[PDB]
């Protein structure tokens, strides 16, 4: 399947298998969790011209971060539309990574791909491991 702007999609990570998800637990922190079909689990992807933004099938918040880019900044449901880039992976072209615009720094799964219900996505520099790449596809 293609992405594009406009549809809605679930990220699964390549290592753990869990989903990019909007924790019920505070509406605001992003983790992996199991996939069940939630609008929590499910992102609608926007072409800005020059980047992607990433809204919340649920809430209607953006897929942002926490603070400034860093080697473990959180990511957390923002306000206002937050731009990433999104590349086909080097090694595995199925797979995507999603970086701040810009920078070294792509989605991670935290703990190299902890399959822990609740764990949480960050920020990390870029590298191989597999906990940073990631399939998005249809819900
Ligand atoms: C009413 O308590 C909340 O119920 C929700 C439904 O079970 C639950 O939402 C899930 O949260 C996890 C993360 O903890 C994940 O986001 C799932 O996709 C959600 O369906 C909330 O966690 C429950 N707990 C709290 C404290 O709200």
Redesign the pocket.
């Known amino acids: 399947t293609q992405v594009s702007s406009g549809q809605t999609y679930k990220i699964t990570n390549v290592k753990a298998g869990t989903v990019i998800?909007?924790?019920?637990?505070?509406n605001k922190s992003i983790?992996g969790?199991p996939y069940?079909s939630?609008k929590?689990?499910q992102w609608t992807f926007n072409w800005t011209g020059k980047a992607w933004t990433l809204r919340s099938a649920s809430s209607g918040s953006y897929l942002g971060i926490e603070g400034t880019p860093a080697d473990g900044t959180r990511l957390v449901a923002v306000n206002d539309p937050f731009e990433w880039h999104i590349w086909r992976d080097e090694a595995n072209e199925n797979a995507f990574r999603i970086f701040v615009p810009f920078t070294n720094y792509n989605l991670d799964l935290s703990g190299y791909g902890d399959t822990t219900?609740?764990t949480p996505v960050q920020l990390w520099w870029t590298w191989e491991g597999l906990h940073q790449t990631w399939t998005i596809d249809r819900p």
């Open positions: 998800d909007l924790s019920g637990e505070d983790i969790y069940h939630g929590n689990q219900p609740g």
